[PDB]
């Protein structure tokens, strides 16, 4: 069962390079505006306790060097929205796709175009962790890399990277400058809170194994939502809500397995173990597939 | 450690839909030639024992309908090279990237752009298994999907999918129509030989773990190349050759751990087992990262 990313062509046409002084990172060019992290007006000695509000007023438009491949963009205005910087240019991007800005919830999935230079270099599929961090790549320079979903022909941008934490994860904001989680863009000691497994996603991954003919883990028993969550808290699983149960309705119909029946299966795997056998080629339970992802891939 | 695919934009601009009678599948439009699997001239009847030379002789150019998005292309010639059909059109692809055709060997990695319609739908990173099959998509219609690498703005095409095997994996050809492995484009009882773990890739993935500060699996022992292969084959691992020892030279230099010392580490995980700990976030040893891949993401 391949974890697949969305094709990145529509986003590749929007990536630019933004340089201010000695620091360079990636920006997003849509219409006649370039979006990038605001801490580009900072150096390393400036990152300690910077006042972006006071620092930005001393900048001038030509202080910003923007290159779209081998062409230079003329900056004609600057402004700031939360933790995102907005550079206005004199030319609208002819490769601009149909797009919109959205904010996702913990547990939802999206694709990330990692640009560790100023030109794209790789793409991968990931999930927003309950502690609001993203694992992703480990080679940097990708500050300003973007995350997105695609629905037919419309790109929904949901994430832009700002910082890399000590454990290899990074943290960021939506495209309107609002951070995900309790992080800030300062040079302070920051650390991610303890993480948790995404219960509804693990259940959706078990429906996909049954659709692919992997049925050894099913049993005859059922459980209550209360009895299950008591199990969930002991193994560091997110509690299951009635909202999550409804989302799984379609897969329960297609397979003929009641949602609380699959919870019985999951209950035994956690309590008892996987006994050497594997589900879809993996000895661990996968939690980076949403219910929606499973149906999209299983028609 | 993200398994990353290459950005797919340059390949997306080359995907077309090819229809012949009742059969439709994906094609590759480069310059004024479209490449696709030759079994697009077959029915469900002809796939048992088709005579392609006889089926192609009965066709004329107007028998082939080629659609590039919202535009139909005019076919002005047809030809066959091994198991690949070549359609000549009167219009060159304006989005043709710098490209070339190559043939890979088992163990190498590449990206797959899955188009289960005539339009792209997902991208993923994979490795050619020692038994010559690919762990690919599971919803069909993707026949004619393409696999590629990108190095310095040049697209290297290495794979096109032709058939779906009974275990869910796919088999295919290079871009010159020659199959990988002992497979043919007939719908006869075919099966892949037993698979094996790609030893040299696992060793490169263990060097990457040491680069990220994960050293718990190391020990103070060394081994001979023969004693290692004696243990390795017992777990269905590929034998290690002196050429594979050389390939790992750079990574051993960067870390300061001799290749045969790392083989000792792997020997211990295999003989004794992993049990409860996980290495790079996996309770299984990973084999879809080549030495080349490791150096490109760990500098």
Author numbering:
A (entry chain A), B (entry chain B): 3 to 301
From the paper:
The main protease (Mpro; also known as Nsp5) of SARS-CoV-2 is one such protein essential to SARS-CoV-2 replication. Mpro is an obligate homodimeric cysteine protease which functions to cleave the viral polyproteins into their individual functional components necessary for viral replication. The active site is located at the interface between Domain I and Domain II, where H41 in Domain I and C145 in Domain II make up the catalytic dyad. Mpro is an obligate dimer because the N-terminus (also called the N-terminal finger) of the second protomer closes the active site of the first protomer.
Interestingly, despite the breakage of the disulfide bond, the active-site loop was not repositioned as the F140 side chain remained flipped in the outward position. This suggests that the disulfide bond stabilizes this inactive state but is not sufficient for generating this conformation. The disulfide bond is thus a consequence of placing the two cysteine residues in proximity following the displacement of the active-site loop. Our work, therefore, indicates that the loss of the π-stacking interaction between F140 and H163 is the source of the inactive conformation of Mpro. And (4), the reduced mutant structure shows that the disulfide bond between C145 and C117 helps to stabilize the inactive conformation when F140 is in the outward position.
